[PDB]
Design an enzyme around this catalytic site. Structure first.
Site, PDB file in Angstrom:
ATOM      1  N   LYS E 137      -0.541  11.219  13.123  1.00 42.91           N
ATOM      2  CA  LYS E 137       0.831  11.326  13.222  1.00 42.91           C
ATOM      3  C   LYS E 137       1.435  11.083  14.714  1.00 42.91           C
ATOM      4  O   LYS E 137       1.842  11.873  15.548  1.00 42.91           O
ATOM      5  CB  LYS E 137       1.367  12.904  12.720  1.00 42.91           C
ATOM      6  CG  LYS E 137       1.060  12.782  11.161  1.00 42.91           C
ATOM      7  CD  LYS E 137       1.583  14.243  10.634  1.00 42.91           C
ATOM      8  CE  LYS E 137       1.445  14.408   9.274  1.00 42.91           C
ATOM      9  NZ  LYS E 137       1.545  15.640   8.936  1.00 42.91           N
TER      10      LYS E 137
HETATM   11  O1  LIG Z   1      -5.257  10.604   9.264  1.00 48.01           O
HETATM   12  C1  LIG Z   1      -5.766  11.167  10.153  1.00 48.01           C
HETATM   13  O2  LIG Z   1      -6.289  10.680  11.215  1.00 48.01           O
HETATM   14  C2  LIG Z   1      -5.551  12.625  10.171  1.00 48.01           C
HETATM   15  C3  LIG Z   1      -6.534  13.478  10.634  1.00 48.01           C
HETATM   16  C4  LIG Z   1      -6.180  14.828  10.505  1.00 48.01           C
HETATM   17  C5  LIG Z   1      -5.275  15.605   9.734  1.00 48.01           C
HETATM   18  C6  LIG Z   1      -4.075  14.674   9.540  1.00 48.01           C
HETATM   19  C7  LIG Z   1      -4.106  13.308   9.639  1.00 48.01           C
HETATM   20  C8  LIG Z   1      -3.090  12.339   9.429  1.00 48.01           C
HETATM   21  O3  LIG Z   1      -2.524  11.664  10.124  1.00 48.01           O
HETATM   22  O4  LIG Z   1      -2.739  12.541   8.059  1.00 48.01           O
END
Ligand SMILES: O=C(O)c1ccccc1C(=O)O
Ligand SMILES: O=C(O)c1ccccc1C(=O)O
Ligand SMILES: O=C(O)c1ccccc1C(=O)O
Ligand SMILES: O=C(O)c1ccccc1C(=O)O
Ligand SMILES: O=C(O)c1ccccc1C(=O)O
Ligand SMILES: O=C(O)c1ccccc1C(=O)O
Lengths: 285, 285, 285, 284, 284, 285
Positions: E137
């Site tokens: 994010k």
């Molecule tokens: O995709 C990732 O790197 C990620 C890793 C851990 C939590 C949330 C995410 C996300 O961005 O949705």
């Protein structure tokens, strides 16, 4: 002072410009380099045309990329009286010869534009006129930076650098919006408060409408001088806040007829579309 | 035939070129677009200068990027008799208005160059000369593609496209190598067998030395016509394999003086350095 | 001579190449850097394969970008007798280790190609042949500059660098144009006068038609040597102006059979498509 | 193999294709006038045995140039020369402009896939279930095609670049001042999402690396007689730890390096010494 | 934190800096004539509490513009306002050209590092030893600075991009037809050098994911009361598998998500909702 | 009107932005694609935060590049009441899942900024104030386009887009020039006539000097509201031509105290530096 104008240049854009020019002139192997070798050498830069010298920052940035140094015997903006020794360039022979054509091409055009600007500024001054001689967006695609900088060196204003610098309502905007007032009100509402709005007008009725709707500048387009001055006189009387620009078919020859006490800016396509390049050479010695 | 010349264009180089011109003209927010809106629209392209139409593929590529379509009423290469309706452009209003100036700028310069090229070809044909009128590397940096293509549309040869297309030994190479014979022998040894070697020669002695050392072409640089033709005549008699090119201070006015039965190629810096842009406009209707 | 070949390289194209290789190898965070630290270090470059050393200017450019310096114990082009200390590299430890693999990859392949080239040159010289051993356009996309340069270091000609350097009519052009004579006449009329035209021919009838229509070079494609030499002999006898190139299925093993007094150029796909990379290592000490 | 095209980053693909075409023709293309713009068709011929790989690249090259391709063989097919592999259609000059770059790409991709399939076959033949893998010994600028080729051949690509796995090598060991310091530093520095692999030239090193928390141990340049006893002990003491063999492994000696305690065998030769297949494109 | 600069890919950095300066000034800079080119010096002021981060970016911006920087505090220092942090030197118009973009970068990098440090501190204060981590994010185009800021603050970055780890999410589960098919496909597809992590919204899914060979299991959007019993069971039957908690975790509720069977806690807020610090650069 | 704002966007810069975002998120192989496959799929876009929807053109451009289509159920600029179904996205499964995060990230930040801007515009309107709420150049590097666009969707003015749009004299320019008057006189002389000059002033004396020297706008920096309004009052009375901007430590909470009848513009760094992203998800169904 013209010597200070180099400070205006965005260095990231400059470096990228230079690279793309050299790539254009030699994308692959350069066999000629074996003819000249890498021996340190010196070349003299010769001005063979009268006019104004402009483009040093570009000439320098080309040669610095190629590990060559330049010494100027004339400052940026000097009058050129042919045949004059303008500079000396030093570095490995093949580097000098690799940069030669691109560097001369840049200096030739920049100087050509600065020369035409200076002639126009001189003719206006000689007709008693104090306002700004200006260029337009009629520039060679990809080469605006050099061309607008050439104008400045010649004493002309560059006018808006690109679409982001000023909001300019033209005949085509007026048609698309359905009328001058609608176009100007939309331009004014849309433009950030930091920007000016200029409106291209082909008659006095349009200019009045444009000023009434909030234009900062009115550009009187393609008027014969005899209708131009009376139009500008009224506009300035009824709207002293609004700047007035004249443009359309203005040439070095007819420019004095377009000068007038109520014209603030005169812009000329010819300063960039029809300025012949100066003649320069670089002779290895 | 000029309508086929578009096929010569490297499409990847073209698309990048077009991007970079639009980026140059509008790097950020374009507030004027709110003035015109997105309504479908039509604009007429008007030729206001005499000369030769050139640059359709560039004009098209600019408008295709912006989701507009173009219909041509005149083929690439047509003679232009002002005031002529050359084309129609169609698309969302703000897209048409966004591309207008860049498109006209490209068309104007390309057409300007082609015009000068055709004038030169016409003057040579009229003096009974059959050879190639050609351009040079004196082009606007970053814009060579449009300029060389213009030359072709006007009936001139482009000459080498860049430093990789031919090995050209010039006065500077001669100086750096320590003499004509050393320079040409090094050029020939260095150049890949697929390449020609051309040698810039300021006298008949040089020309003979260059031919003897294996030059494919000899360029007679800055001769007065009176010295040029006797020199060419001798060279062709002793070395019929060697093509002869004339160049230096050749203008549309004096060109007939430089035509001769022993000159194969005449190249002119002016075709690109001093060709004024044609006047076009694009009126929304 | 090989030490001078570096001068041929376009510096802008070289810099962007190196950037793009390092981007490819590490686009984001490099956690391994924390393992090595920024302590000044030194590494030795080892040649573990026999052959010819080529690619120093690329190896240097990679390391210079990463603030490291290189000292060569062997000049560009040297015969390599394993296991040999070829160079020392110095700089911050993490910078050395970041550039290691890309620099070795580049030097390995450049050297691989130069070695195959030199072996081919050697086998030709040993069979009494004086002409040019040459490469082709059968290069790894995006890597042509390193591969053509490798050829040169090994003593082979590179052949045309790209589609801009020569006009080459092949079987597919012959088909599309409707016949040998139409293809060659079209090639000659289309190509700028500065360019040569070469025509791929699969029989002696084709070769004669190509030479008659104005080819500078005829490439005899896929002949068995027994048919090749009589064909070349006739051609040279009728058309001594026309250079003759042999190509198709030529290997290091069969190359002496393809050499003949009437062959000027022998070009081999294998020199770039099937040259194994040499084994180099870079050991920190 | 038909599904492998999905792996490809489309933005990176498009830029690749552009730069290949720019490399092959930066300026005016005079040859185009010889062919013209008439619609045309060309047959793709396979003239070498091996494995077909690189369809997505070949397609991307031709789509840019407004040509279409129909495949008669799926990605990954065995090639028995002389075979009609495909048909390409479009304006004549477009076909001829793309020809050489498209053949070059398919030749090399296929070359690498063929060497990878030969290596996978020899391993399977010697009873081995592990992963045959490539290395970072790739042509600079062309990794995307090379790693993809490996996958079409059935080999594993190994880490795609420096960001996919932390690999501690002899050089890292020297710079850190020893195996244990190198591995502890690698483990502390690497994000928890990444594995740590350690190149070890002896059993002592491999034990030290395993003890310091390596996920993989790469036994580098062992003769097979020392390799298998070493792997055996390691797997017995550290069953968590994957074992990779690499260094001087060839198609010929590969069966000797297979063993029940090797998980991964990586080979520089699959990308450094894979000859390109012979393809042509004949306008008809 | 002083060593973290070494992680930065120098090619990507230079291109980033260029594009930031192009963004802020694409054409003529008329303000340059107001300041001139005389030598000048400016003081960098921290006006916000938190953690200083982004020195390498701030330096690269100014180096391009022929300016030099001296730091009075090392990367990662606590900031107690109002503090003189640095001095910049160079030609007046170059300093003033760089000023905003440099401050923008440091402000955000520092903002992120500060939030990360606050989160690490709250976890440490609740007895928790695991990794606080970021997510993907991030602001598009600005990932390098944001992930680097996380590191400076003491959080793990988590996977840098899609190439670092294979992450099976809700949406992969749906597309594959269920947890086990998804994880088996992930495992078969992922190079052996990569780990596979699976986002699970229930214990059921977690177990299935563990059984199918996940290296990590991410417990998404659990209330803390359901989270710890789930993690406990998972660690008992599958001690090899790392456990990550994520979803709605804030600085405030973070201590309730810490538990002895959670290895990683990832927080979108560290990058989505970290206010920038206030810095100024005053010419003196 | 928010649905029209998409027209402002420069399409070349947009496409390049989108590319660089996707390259950042996935530079090499994407193994996760094999888990989803290429089967046509659909996903619902959910808004889980209150505020204002902004960023559709970005979100669309991301998905269009990946051959996905989007249907919006809410127009750009809509108030978001969670949990709301905002849109549907369709295309091959792996394409949807490839673009998901980057598209959400963009929409989340754009919407976050638009929400803060709308809250600020509402609080001003509620305190009876008619002027422009504006942003600043305090934007995330590389991401200005999305951030300034977000401001506009929320009803705030963007302020100058970059250094090219206005000439802003700040405390630092004042020190470098040697005083208020010298700085303003230099700024006006240097700025092209099409640009405005704004001057950051920390006292009434400076504001008066700046207005006298020709400033178009005076920005009253870091005033407490009690000193601000009386300063603005005096300034408007003596210089009614001069627009007045307030800025420095203005927050959503204190904003109504900074509104007044002699303030034309209020700019807030918080709108871009402290605007939390909205929560959106994309759930395949
Ligand atoms: O995709 C990732 O790197 C990620 C890793 C851990 C939590 C949330 C995410 C996300 O961005 O949705
Ligand atoms: O190029 C034009 O049409 C033009 C002509 C005169 C003034 C300004 C401009 C401009 O667009 O900036
Ligand atoms: O540009 C030149 O000097 C030039 C002049 C005449 C012919 C050819 C060239 C060339 O360099 O290609
Ligand atoms: O690559 C080829 O097909 C080729 C083969 C032999 C000679 C020249 C070339 C060439 O096109 O330059
Ligand atoms: O390229 C190498 O040296 C290498 C060799 C074997 C395995 C892995 C790698 C790798 O670096 O990724
Ligand atoms: O960013 C700033 O310092 C700033 C603050 C208020 C208004 C305008 C600006 C601006 O520079 O564009």
């Amino acid at each position: 002072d013209a010597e200070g104008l180099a400070l205006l240049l965005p260095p990231v854009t400059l470096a990228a410009l230079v690279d793309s020019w050299l790539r254009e002139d030699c994308p692959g192997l350069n066999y000629a380099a074996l003819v000249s070798g890498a021996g340190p050498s010196q070349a003299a830069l010769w001005a063979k045309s009268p006019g104004v010298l402009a483009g040093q920052p570009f000439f320098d940035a080309i040669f610095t990329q190629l590990n060559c140094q330049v010494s100027w015997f004339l400052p940026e903006g000097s009058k050129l009286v042919p045949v004059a020794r303008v500079a000396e360039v030093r570095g490995p022979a093949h580097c000098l010869l690799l940069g030669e054509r691109v560097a001369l091409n840049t200096l030739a055009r920049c100087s050509g534009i600065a020369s035409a600007a200076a002639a126009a500024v001189e003719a206006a001054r000689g007709a008693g006129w104090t306002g700004h001689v200006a260029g337009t967006r009629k520039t060679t695609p990809g080469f605006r930076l050099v061309e607008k900088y050439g104008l400045l060196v010649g004493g002309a204003a560059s006018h808006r650098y690109d679409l982001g610098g000023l909001v300019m309502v033209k005949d085509n905007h007026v048609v698309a919006a359905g009328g001058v007032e609608k176009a100007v009100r939309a331009a004014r509402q849309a433009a950030d408060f930091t920007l000016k709005v200029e409106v291209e007008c082909s008659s006095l009725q349009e200019a009045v409408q444009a000023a009434e709707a909030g234009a900062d500048l009115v550009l009187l387009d393609n008027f014969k001088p005899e209708e131009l001055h009376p139009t500008a006189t009224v506009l300035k009387a009824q709207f002293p806040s609004v700047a007035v620009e004249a443009s359309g078919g203005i040439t070095l020859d007819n420019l004095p007829q377009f000068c007038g006490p109520h014209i603030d800016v005169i812009s000329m396509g010819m300063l960039t579309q029809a300025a012949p390049a100066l003649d320069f050479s670089l002779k290895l010695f």
